[PDB]
Amino acid sequence: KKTFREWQYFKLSITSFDQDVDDAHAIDQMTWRQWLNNALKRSYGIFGEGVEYSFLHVDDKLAYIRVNHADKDTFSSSISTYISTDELVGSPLTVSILQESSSLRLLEVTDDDRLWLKKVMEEEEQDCKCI
Amino acid sequence: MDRTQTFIKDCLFTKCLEDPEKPFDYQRINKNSKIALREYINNCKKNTKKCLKLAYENKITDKEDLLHYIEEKHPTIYESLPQYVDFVPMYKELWINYIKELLNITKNLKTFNGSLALLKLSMADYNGALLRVTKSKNKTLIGLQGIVIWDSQKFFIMIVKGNIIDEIKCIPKKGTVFQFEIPISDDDDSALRYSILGDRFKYRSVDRAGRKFKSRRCDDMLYYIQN
Amino acid sequence: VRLKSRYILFEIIFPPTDTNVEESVSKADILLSHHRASPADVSIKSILQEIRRSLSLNLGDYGSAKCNSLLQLKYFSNKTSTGIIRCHREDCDLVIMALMLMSKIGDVDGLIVNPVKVSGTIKKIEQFAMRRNSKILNIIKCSQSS
Amino acid sequence: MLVDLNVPWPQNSYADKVTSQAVNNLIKTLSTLHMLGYTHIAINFTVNHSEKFPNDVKLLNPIDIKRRFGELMDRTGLKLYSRITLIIDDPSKGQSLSKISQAFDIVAALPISEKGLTLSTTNLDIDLLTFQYGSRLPTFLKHKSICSCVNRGVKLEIVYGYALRDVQARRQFVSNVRSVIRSSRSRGIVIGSGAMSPLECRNILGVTSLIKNLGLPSDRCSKAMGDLASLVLLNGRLRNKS
Amino acid sequence: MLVDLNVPWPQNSYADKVTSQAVNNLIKTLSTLHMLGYTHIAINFTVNHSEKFPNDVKLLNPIDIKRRFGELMDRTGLKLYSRITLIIDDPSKGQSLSKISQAFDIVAALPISEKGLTLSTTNLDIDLLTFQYGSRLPTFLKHKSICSCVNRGVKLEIVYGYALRDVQARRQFVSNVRSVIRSSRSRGIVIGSGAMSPLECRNILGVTSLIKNLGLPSDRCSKAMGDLASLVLLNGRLRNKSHKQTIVTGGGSGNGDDVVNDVQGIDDVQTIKVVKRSMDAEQLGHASKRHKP
RNA sequence: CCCGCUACGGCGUGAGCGUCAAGGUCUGUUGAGUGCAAUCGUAGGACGUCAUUAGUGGCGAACCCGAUACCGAUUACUGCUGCUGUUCCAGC
């Protein structure tokens, strides 16, 4: 008579100073995955690299990352641990984790991608409730 | 047959039998000055309550008409009433001039020394001071100004006026912050404002003349950060 | 609250990697063939330096940071190849999984590590180890008498 | 008492003859399984779905538990069961289950395809589902295909012997196993040792710690390894006998 | 409200002179801590015990809150405190706490040895105990000693920015912090960011996750930044400006003036605070019966 | 000390008793009993409190861990209950 936690969202915002770098460099989608694998490879080993995370609603130095519940802090301690260095950017960057929620309800802009992600989640929640 | 015997271990033994059971005229007043002071501060509160009752019977909101009404119709009741209009100049001028003499507050302010001044305030008595409850654990104690008639150990005694209220006001010191203004002789240019905390000192003024105050754990001061 | 640490008993077992020579099928004979001997360059500091390198390359840095707070080898002797590792009660899972992934020593390869007994005190682990070795002597004596 | 049900047979095709070294290596690794202390051993054999099944009765199983392992069954004090994993990708050259289930005991499958997972959950009365933990994940695991299959009775299997093969394969192993754990709802997880050499066998204390740190609780892991393993053994045994 | 009370100053000895690049770097990292969000910053400065302390009054502090940070404050809207961590190892001849304490706001210590750690908790009037997380713990932290020190006052301080320096230092950092949390009984834990650059700054929810992964709970972490952080500020702030938590020169207004919050409205020349005539004994009664304010 | 051999004190067995000595032992240890110091992990259901955008989510705390047992006193914290004192607000 309960609800099993599927995963948890994580709201990241790459705070980048030295405004010349913020205007010149533009992080593409593969750089996100490479830097997150490098961050999980520096402070953690193989098991910390094998944390399941996918990319959702990527904006200009803005990311939503879904990570399973039983390793939530295992993600969120490492993101505030590793510092970016020697990966196509001359200066290191800082990371601000803005908010965490396990109930799908966040309000960023009035954009329409969030409603599509909510419909994709409800199509799985109906299969969880029925089957 | 369980280990937890309720009736046996307490009600039926001889050691815990004492525990509750599991089925269950002028000379006599001033003999001591403290007890006479207690009788005076009780009589002032009783006379203030009688003054509030006679003020509702008067149905006049003005206090200057109320005092003359009590003088006309209630002579014995008027005899123990305080006089705040008399109380302000007989206390404030002496207190301000004593602090201007003691802390060496003169026209030359650029030779001041703060640490010795705070040590003198730790050595000076607060009997006769105007003091204001600025922060407190209770939300109703704040906003009260009053002049000291007596210093207690852990409470504080002031007097304040309302529209018609002239009650002796006792305020706890454990968890309150007090402040007092020290004026300078120039008009509207500069003045000082100092603060004390009544929870920090919890002794008599007799002990306060001798005690050298030391550090405390100061964990219960979260209210001063909270409000 | 005191130092609630957990001790872990481990034993080094050498599997008989030899496909060209035939094998005998018995209980105490295969106990003899697995519990043979430890090699020459095996000490406390060598096993600690190997397990810290396995902790680094397998579990990482912050996992090694949580593990290496009270990570010591309290008792070990190369004549019997049994060792006792002190650890925290929370990271006992991490220490046992690090003992599992021990692949090879830098000098001698071809070996497995068996974590056998875990408890919060070393005095009961020694008492269980003496009884387990007594059972090993019983099996050896039963196969030796007949 | 423990059940280890994923030991491979060193042969892939019926045309290849098993050498004398492979049989001795299998005796070595099964003696290594009994050395740490196990009770049940169910050795596995791999076939492809594109392979043409033989039309025989007493020749479907090139394992021969009775003539080779029948001596070690009496000497060592254990027993063997025969099982088949099915490497199925496409629905072609197949749909035969009434003959392969009678000879062997436990019927498993290896889907690597998106439609293969659907045809495995739909029209295969099998015991266990195995995924390739060595190679990459096929498309994406969902709750829709797993919850309809676990509630039927088919269990999901994790191979802790495939982790001790390479260094690079360990990352894909953890990524597959944690996906199986988050999709499985921590109920139908049976684990087995896929060791080909005696240098890759571990004991219950390390493997329980492995599956505990990968994401399965200690109640579900030990409860699975006893009850669900010995229940699917009797499932295969009653599909044989009844 | 959030307090970050271990920002280091780029100087170790009084003979060295700070260049303008480090000052601009500190301005940029204060703008960084103002950008995402924080409330209080107490910048730290390090001296040794065997150094030669200067016999000055207005030259003990190379902090200069008034001339440069007073200009940064108007565009920032925050405040800075100056504090000293005492690197004491042996009971040498150097003892000048009566000037170094009264010059600065918060007094801390950095012990290395056995007896120094005892005499710091016993006799030395400090506010916080910082340990060298970069190096090894000296011998052992006992329960009843640290517990009695927390009951006396002084709490322990964890520097999560020191793990962001090197790779090898993280293991020694966690091995120190777990022992500190175990032996401190989770009472006296104040956390701070020892970053020398804005490139090592974090948000509240990441530091909370770090404290989660170290071993201390989450509600107790935010309570340590709300309750425990701002009280040990007030301890040193009342000890050094006022008497020994007895009589304060700080104006108690409604919600704007405080000893912690109103630093600029107090004349930091000697003690005083110039306040206009807000208290009139002539015609002011109860607060709810007034009409002029 | 009783039995058999031998006879100057002697010898062999009773799974016998009494005295004396020995840092040889004391899990001879307790409806918990460790002593390089165990007192666990997870899942489901029942109850209580608090916050909700559809109905669920979080929490069951803090102090402290004995070392043979018991009782009385003191000290650290939460909740309930009675009394006392203070402040604020009115019914006439």
How far, in Å, CA of A34 to CA of A46, rounded?
15
Please state whether beta strands C5-13 and B191-197 pair in parallel, antiparallel, or not at all (unpaired): unpaired
- Which nucleotide minimizes the distance between its C1' and the CA of B142? F87
Please state whether beta strands B155-159 and C112-119 pair in parallel, antiparallel, or not at all (unpaired): unpaired
Residue type, B47: N
Q: What is the CATH number of the domain that holds D78?
A: 3.20.20.140
A76 in contact with E at a CB cutoff of 8 Å?
Answer: yes
**Both structure tokens of D69:** 């392992």
E272 in contact with B at a CB cutoff of 8 Å?
Answer: yes
How far, in Å, CA of B65 to CA of B59, rounded?
11
Residues of A whose CB is below 8 A from C58: 45-47
Q: Within 10 Å of residue A33's Cβ, how many Cβ atoms? A: 12
DSSP structure string for A36-85: HHHHHHHSB-HHHHT--EEEEEEETTEEEEEEEGGGHHHHHHHHTT----
Q: Within 10 Å of residue B35's Cβ, how many Cβ atoms? A: 12
D34 in contact with A at a CB cutoff of 8 Å?
Answer: no
Any residues with CB less than 8 A from the CB of A22 and at least 6 apart, and which?
A16
The DSSP call for residue B20 is P
**Both structure tokens of A13:** 């915002």
Rounded to 10 deg, the angle between the E204-214 and E218-226 helix axes is 130
Query: Shortest CB distance from A70 goes to which of D142, D179, D215?
Result: D215
Residues of B whose CB is below 8 A from E252: 132, 134-135, 177-179, 193, 195
Within 13 Å, how many C-alpha atoms sit on residue B215's CB side? 21
How far, in Å, CA of C34 to CA of C32, rounded?
6
CB E185 within 8 A of CB E223: no
DSSP structure string for B130-184: EEEEEEESSTTSTT-EEE-SEE-SSEEEEE---SS---EEEEE-TTEEEEEEEE-
D122 in contact with A at a CB cutoff of 8 Å?
Answer: no
Q: Which residue is nearest to nucleotide F66 (CA to C1')?
A: C1
How far, in Å, CA of D150 to CA of D223, rounded?
16
Range of the domain at E136: 1-293
CB A97 within 8 A of CB A12: yes
CB B156 within 8 A of CB B171: yes
Query: Shortest CB distance from A127 goes to which of D143, D174, D182?
Result: D143
How far, in Å, CA of B138 to CA of E251, rounded?
20
Residues of A whose CB is below 8 A from C61: 42-44
How far, in Å, CA of B55 to CA of B198, rounded?
35
**Gyration radius of chain A over CA positions:** 16
The neighbouring-strand residues paired with E242 are none
**Both structure tokens of B60:** 């006049």
How far, in Å, CA of A95 to CA of E206, rounded?
9
Binary contact (A48, C57; C-beta < 8 A): no
Residue type, E67: R
- Which nucleotide minimizes the distance between its C1' and the CA of E150? F76
Query: Shortest CB distance from C69 goes to which of E167, E178, E213?
Result: E178
Residue D98, Cβ density class (10 Å: 0-12 exposed, 13-18 middle, ≥19 buried): exposed
The DSSP call for residue E8 is E
How far, in Å, CA of D86 to CA of D150, rounded?
18
Phi-psi region of B88 (alpha: psi -120 to 50; beta: other; left: phi over 0): alpha
Query: Chain C interface, mutation test: which of E140, E144, E171, E212, most C Cβ atoms within 10 Å?
Result: E171
Walk across the sheet containing D106-111 and list its strands: D3-8, D40-48, D79-88, D106-111, D128-130, D155-159, D189-192
Q: Do chain E and D touch: 3 or more Cβ pairs under 8 angstroms? A: no
Rounded to 10 deg, the angle between the D143-150 and A113-130 helix axes is 0
Any residues with CB less than 8 A from the CB of D143 and at least 6 apart, and which?
A124, A127, A128, A131, D183, D185
The neighbouring-strand residues paired with A10 are A65, A100
CB E224 within 8 A of CB E191: yes
CB D180 within 8 A of CB D189: yes
How far, in Å, CA of C136 to CA of D37, rounded?
13
Binary contact (E175, C61; C-beta < 8 A): no
How far, in Å, CA of A28 to CA of B195, rounded?
59
Nucleotides of F strand lying within 7 Å of any protein CB atom = 27, 31-32, 34-46, 53, 56-57, 63-66, 71-72, 85-89, 92
Domain ranges of chain C: 1-146
CB E2 within 8 A of CB E42: no
**Both structure tokens of D207:** 């493997």
- In a 3-state reduction of DSSP, which class is residue C50? helix
Question: Counting one residue from A and one from E, how many pairs have CB atoms under 8 Å apart?
Answer: 61
Residue whose C-alpha is closest to residue A58's, from A88, A80, A36: A36
The neighbouring-strand residues paired with C75 are C84
**Domains: count for chain E:** 1
Any residues with CB less than 8 A from the CB of E229 and at least 6 apart, and which?
E2, E3, E5, E40, E190, E191
Residue type, B5: Q
Please state whether beta strands D128-130 and D106-111 pair in parallel, antiparallel, or not at all (unpaired): parallel
The DSSP call for residue D19 is P
CB E67 within 8 A of CB E86: no
Binary contact (C62, A44; C-beta < 8 A): yes
Contact residues, chain E to chain C, C-beta under 8 Å: 143, 167, 170-171, 173-175, 178-179, 182, 185, 213, 215
How far, in Å, CA of B132 to CA of B145, rounded?
4
Backbone gaps in chain E, preceding residues (C–N over 2.5 A) = none
Q: What angle do CA D233, D236, D239 make, to 5 degrees?
A: 150
End-to-end CA distance of chain B: 56
How far, in Å, CA of D71 to CA of B53, rounded?
111
Residue A17, Cβ density class (10 Å: 0-12 exposed, 13-18 middle, ≥19 buried): buried
E215 in contact with A at a CB cutoff of 8 Å?
Answer: no
Q: Within 10 Å of residue E232's Cβ, how many Cβ atoms? A: 24
Q: Which method was it determined by? A: cryo-EM
- In a 3-state reduction of DSSP, which class is residue D219? helix
Q: Which residue is nearest to nucleotide F34 (CA to C1')?
A: C121
The DSSP call for residue E51 is S
Rounded to a whole number of angstroms, the distance from the CA of D174 to the nearest CA of chain A is 5
End-to-end CA distance of chain A: 15
Q: Give the number of residues written for chain A.
A: 131
Residue whose C-alpha is closest to residue E209's, from A64, D211, D178, C62: C62
Residue type, A8: Q
Residue D129, Cβ density class (10 Å: 0-12 exposed, 13-18 middle, ≥19 buried): buried
How far, in Å, CA of D94 to CA of D48, rounded?
10
Question: D5 CA, F2 C1': separation in Å?
Answer: 73
Any residues with CB less than 8 A from the CB of B222 and at least 6 apart, and which?
E227, E231
CB E185 within 8 A of CB E149: no
Q: What angle do CA A10, A12, A13 make, to 5 degrees?
A: 165
HEC string of E76-111? HCCCEEEEEEEECCCCCCCCCHHHHHHHCCEEEECC
- In a 3-state reduction of DSSP, which class is residue D129? strand
The neighbouring-strand residues paired with B132 are B145, B179
How far, in Å, CA of A76 to CA of A78, rounded?
5
Query: Shortest CB distance from B114 goes to which of E125, E271, E276?
Result: E271
Binary contact (B130, E279; C-beta < 8 A): yes
Q: What angle do CA A23, A27, A31 make, to 5 degrees?
A: 155
Query: Shortest CB distance from E207 goes to which of A42, A73, A80?
Result: A80
Rounded to a whole number of angstroms, the distance from the CA of D14 to the nearest CA of chain C is 23
Query: Shortest CB distance from A49 goes to which of D143, D171, D185?
Result: D171
Residue whose C-alpha is closest to residue C30's, from C140, C115, C129: C140
Please state whether beta strands A7-15 and A62-68 pair in parallel, antiparallel, or not at all (unpaired): antiparallel
DSSP structure string for E36-75: S--SEEEEEEEEESSS-----SSSS----IIIIIHHHHHH
Question: What resolution does the deposited structure have, in angstroms?
Answer: 3.5
Query: Chain D interface, mutation test: which of C8, C96, C103, most D Cβ atoms within 10 Å?
Result: C96
Residues of E whose CB is below 8 A from C65: 170-171, 173-175
Q: Give the number of residues written for chain B.
A: 227
DSSP structure string for E160-199: TTGGGT-STHHHHHHHHHHHHHHHTTTTSEEEE---SSGG
Any residues with CB less than 8 A from the CB of D125 and at least 6 apart, and which?
D97, D101, D107
How far, in Å, CA of D52 to CA of D49, rounded?
8
The neighbouring-strand residues paired with E43 are E7, E82
Distances from the Cα of D112 to the Cα of B170, C130, D101, D137, D141, angstroms: 83, 50, 22, 8, 12
Q: Which residue is nearest to nucleotide F52 (CA to C1')?
A: A103
How far, in Å, CA of C132 to CA of C114, rounded?
14
What are the φ and ψ backbone dihedral angles of E96, each rounded to 5 degrees? -135, 45
Within 13 Å, how many C-alpha atoms sit on residue D97's CB side? 14
Q: Which residue of A has its CA nearest to E163?
A: A81
Please state whether beta strands B130-136 and B145-147 pair in parallel, antiparallel, or not at all (unpaired): antiparallel
How far, in Å, CA of B125 to CA of B214, rounded?
19
Look-up: residue for tokens 């009035």? A110
Any residues with CB less than 8 A from the CB of B57 and at least 6 apart, and which?
none
CB E193 within 8 A of CB E203: no
How far, in Å, CA of A43 to CA of A46, rounded?
10
- In a 3-state reduction of DSSP, which class is residue D144? helix
How far, in Å, CA of E235 to CA of E152, rounded?
12
**Both structure tokens of E114:** 């056995």
Helix (H) or strand (E) holding A33: helix A29-42
Domain ranges of chain A: 1-131
**Both structure tokens of C44:** 């406390």
Q: Do chain B and E touch: 3 or more Cβ pairs under 8 angstroms? A: yes
CB E262 within 8 A of CB E250: yes
Residue whose C-alpha is closest to residue D51's, from D103, D115, D94: D94
Rounded to a whole number of angstroms, the distance from the CA of E254 to the nearest CA of chain B is 7
How far, in Å, CA of B201 to CA of B121, rounded?
13
Sign of CA dihedral D57, D63, D68, D69: negative
